[PDB]
Symmetry: C3
Subunit: 492 residues, 3 copies
Amino acid sequence: AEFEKSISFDGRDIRLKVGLLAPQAGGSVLIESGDTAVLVTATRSPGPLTVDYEERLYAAGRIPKTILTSRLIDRPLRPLFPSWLRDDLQVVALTMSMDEQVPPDVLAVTGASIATLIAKIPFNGPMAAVRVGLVGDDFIINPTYAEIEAGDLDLVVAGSPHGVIMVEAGANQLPERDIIEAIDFGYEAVRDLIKAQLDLVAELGLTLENYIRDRASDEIKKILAQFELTKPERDAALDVVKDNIATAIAELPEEDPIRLAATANSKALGNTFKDITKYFMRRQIVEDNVRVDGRKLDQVRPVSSQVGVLPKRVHGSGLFNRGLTQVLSACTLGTPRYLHHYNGALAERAILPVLPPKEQFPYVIRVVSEVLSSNGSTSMGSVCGSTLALMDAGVPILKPVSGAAMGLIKEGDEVRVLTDIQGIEDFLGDMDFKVAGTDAGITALQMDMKISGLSLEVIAQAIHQAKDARLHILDKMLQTIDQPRTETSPYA
Amino acid sequence: AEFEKSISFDGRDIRLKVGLLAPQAGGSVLIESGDTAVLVTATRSPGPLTVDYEERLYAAGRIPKTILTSRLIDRPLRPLFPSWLRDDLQVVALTMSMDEQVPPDVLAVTGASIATLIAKIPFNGPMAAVRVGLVGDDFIINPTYAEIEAGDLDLVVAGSPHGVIMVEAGANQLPERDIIEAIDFGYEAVRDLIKAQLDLVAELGLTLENYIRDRASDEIKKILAQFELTKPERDAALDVVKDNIATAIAELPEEDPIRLAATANSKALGNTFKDITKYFMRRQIVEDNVRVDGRKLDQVRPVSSQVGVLPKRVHGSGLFNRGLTQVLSACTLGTPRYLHHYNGALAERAILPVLPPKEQFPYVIRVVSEVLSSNGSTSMGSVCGSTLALMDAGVPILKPVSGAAMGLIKEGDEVRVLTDIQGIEDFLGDMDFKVAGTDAGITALQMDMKISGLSLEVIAQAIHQAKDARLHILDKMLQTIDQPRTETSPYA
Amino acid sequence: AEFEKSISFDGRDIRLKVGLLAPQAGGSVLIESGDTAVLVTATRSPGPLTVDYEERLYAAGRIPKTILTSRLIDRPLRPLFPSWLRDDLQVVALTMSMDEQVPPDVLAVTGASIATLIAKIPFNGPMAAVRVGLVGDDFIINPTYAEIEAGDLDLVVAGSPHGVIMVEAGANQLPERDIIEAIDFGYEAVRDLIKAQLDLVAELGLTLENYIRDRASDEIKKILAQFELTKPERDAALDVVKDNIATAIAELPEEDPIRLAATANSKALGNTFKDITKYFMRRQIVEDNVRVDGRKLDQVRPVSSQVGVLPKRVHGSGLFNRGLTQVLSACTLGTPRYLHHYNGALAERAILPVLPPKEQFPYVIRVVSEVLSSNGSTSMGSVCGSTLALMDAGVPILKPVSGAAMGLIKEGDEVRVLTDIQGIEDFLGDMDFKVAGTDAGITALQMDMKISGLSLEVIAQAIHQAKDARLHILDKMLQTIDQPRTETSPYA
Ligand SMILES: [Mg+2]
Ligand SMILES: [Mg+2]
Ligand SMILES: [Mg+2]
């Protein structure tokens, strides 16, 4: 049966209703704030985490960006479930009323944790998320739409007992110190929601691996230590290692036990393989101070760039290289905006603050980032190329924008922060942290983790190390083009 | 080569053309009435019944609801094929000319049977379907569009030698007696089309189970007899029974014959399991007079309901419960209609007759039924919640509408009619019969069967028993709200 | 790193850029002509040929037929790869700038070959394609859009060292001799692009079968020699042969080697089966002068046709039969064009030249070809039926259009040309060659090959033999309707 609980929370009460709706779900709540309401259920099934968010139109008046809010719920949820879970986990979040003030998206993130705790599914939570804006000089928790439209900051922080799990931000060239303060200010309200989820819990009363390891470990060390090897080559080399192991398992007959224990898991080969590769890259990074391609922990990959790659029809052309990550940006100017597709939100969030006001430049601006090769932050290459293409097209942008992605190896007390991560530094690492911006401050953020979280102290260090990467990449794209062209394209 | 046959049929001749089109199909006919023509083919392939209906736009003038007509053909076809058929059966129906009088949908249903008989595929037919309308006090077979738009009744009856297989109706608060008479009047024209399909046939010249049964039967009795068990629990209990049987089959080695006879059918476990559960629920119902949750054969599940579940932005809110079936209806009012989605046709067919005339209420009315839990007629919960939400929104409806679904166990001479069926009463039963309406009469019908049909006499009894369910559910939703609110929403 | 190469080519230089873009691709080039640029990559992966073409909108000005250009690249590529290739082959072609003169489609075809050679994937190339138009009396290689819109011819020729692999044409009732000359003129520029791809290559420095054969061969001869057997029957007969072979392989236990060599390839049964059937149909055709249904190598299947199959609402009705290939065409006339769908491009390419000028006939013309049975050229049946339906609707077309598909068996020095091919003559043959047109000349072409190519000399013979088929089919559709009706439909 139904139970309300109110939580006093920065002026806007957050109300939870359990026992009201979806009685066949593992756990459920109507989480409500003001007059915004979203229903969040969670169900473990025999079988793996599907999160569907719906924004109903009757919630505001029905007449004849949801996938982003789908990922916003999923990202901080995923790495809190134990890794050995193989049952199906269905999370549904339907927004059923929009108050013209309260945005529902952070409400659904918090409800997802609440609903998983009521379904008493093992996970290392609870988690919560808040939004932080900035009006004048005042940070504000869960601002309305009005402050989002008027203010200088729009960031989401999700955390848990073990720290911050997700950040997602737009900002108007905010300095690192204020971004760090906003993150910290918002993680403290996350903790206030962690408590009172813990209060709700109290209230309502809630063989083969060794085989592979021994055969393959000393082989993986050496590929990981071969710094002259490019990413394609090291991928073809680690594949051959795994292939010979498969051949050895195939050679022995059905009589051996591990062949049956391996035909009982047609994938364990890959999982243990990656886990051995993860371990040896990590020890390579923590004790030795070198990454898998020989670079220092602060070193940025070699950067290349050019302008006007395409004919002057394409109003703006820009090619960017970071190692084997390649992006070609194309700029179109039109008539009666500002948008950008990625074959996207992160880079238009990162470009917008420097786009000139309608008064000066009345074209509608259209940027397409063709990702032609991927090895790290293709979304940061998309930002960098976008700026180049806008400068080739004569768009009088305030400042050029650049960005890089940081990584993290966290081996106990040992913590290392990587700049401009290789793909497998992202796959076998603990953090994917994109930061974009200008000479003056930050414009866009995006953090994903595969562990239960990080302290704010380590986030501050990654944000400081990433300004150096952004500075180095930007101060070397200006050797391709230092100003926007004074004139536009004859076909613009 | 081509052959015509005309059938004299209530004023409108029905013409069939065989040997004309689709010469690689098992069987085919252009069935035509007036100047409406639809081509219906049927092909058995080695491999399971796919029915695709297409309504071409050149049929009426091509310029730059078909899935419902797809189901209308499929539903009365499916349960006439023997259950042991595993070959692929492709039925295609293309409407190739619309006469502005004759609706083609019932033509395609009849052709589907004709085409299956020519392909000489085993099935317990023939079947046919007709439409019945009512103009003034005159029932009429296969009315035009004009009578459908003007009249008081729009029902489809499909039958076969063994009785009626499908009904689908809209009506304007018609009393049960007239609905029963229309069904009977239309089944008699169905029989007139059964004959003359039989005339066409004459013219053209057309080990493991016992193992599972013995291990599991006395176990299934007891779960089925445990009335205090909720539906989730009894589902988790019957699963454990099947799981232990799987474990026992896995325990014995490849040496036993049934393990190979079971690895020859990776599903027979479930089929025999369900067949044992079907048998014991049925004997539970016929000899004992009790259902699986302890209810009498006329008993309706406990009903709950409330109004204004959502904030007053949502112009109308209504939550309905029947056992573990839960529906939340939401009402939106707008400006320059009447429609309803289901996450739909049956409930707008059932609400429409009480919607006020434009003169009084000029808003466009929009209802969304969120099905939050399913255990029986979620479409009838959708009707009930819709009425509640319309009453919360101040829509001055003529009368409130409610509905329930009836079921049938037919064990030979023994026939039992269930009210407000549980899911497995629908899965392991012989009939799913939805009836909706008001204090005065019926508004909407929908019948599906998994057997070859029922006599009209049993249909009359299910329709009478269902008025009692509708009455009980309605007379207990008025204890939540007895009148529409005199005023609308401040945000309407 | 990046390398340009220019190729002097009929006035319009073709420039190639390698080492510039997509550095993780097997091979890549920006191929450019004038200011049209398309990027073409090619990658072999462990696993089968996927070709994706994209036409970006920024290439011309981006604002808020590609599948045909996808097939145009794929068709001449496919049969140049060795048949024993099982690795994945990804070909991507992005058009990144449209010059208002140069059409990019033939550029991507040529780049696909260039990119495969740089990825040094085994294939029997290189290939190239060009477009040929006709302005006045001047053939022109790779015309602009202006000549395409104004001229009389629009054909694509793709070839390789072994001959022509693909043709695709629209034309205004061009005589066979000029079509043959255009093909030959364009294949010579294809050879000029073959060379200078060879110059680039030089520059940059680039048991079970016998079992099945012995069991089944003398059985397949006899089904193939049974001329009174219809296509369905011979398909059911060859299936039984393969089924008994499967039974024999199943009868023997795991002890035999071929059962394990056959459970190592769960498809080799079909492949060897088809390969035996291919061989014996081919020897049936080359030494004996008879096809599998008893027809001569120039014989057209029996043709049937009728007009007004549907009610006079359907402004035009036409049913065409060639053997078991059946098409029903339907004609709609409207108001403020000329298009045709196929349930399409080839038949509107083939009808357009005889459609009357706006001055005389101002309706918008809409033709739908329902393919009701397939055994050969359903697209040529679509042309023939379209003409019939246009004549039933009173459209005053200049001349009626008809067409047929030719085939080829090429057994070494032995070369046989088939008219109006059966399905398996297309599956087990070397060529599918559709030609459509009128009394005066040709209107539409489409050639596919599964071998590395044919000499122009054999193409000239197939084009001459196909005029006879078109003539015979047309001069026998006029015995159904010899003129368009002087008046239109009462419902037109
Ligand atoms: Mg990532
Ligand atoms: Mg049902
Ligand atoms: Mg073909």
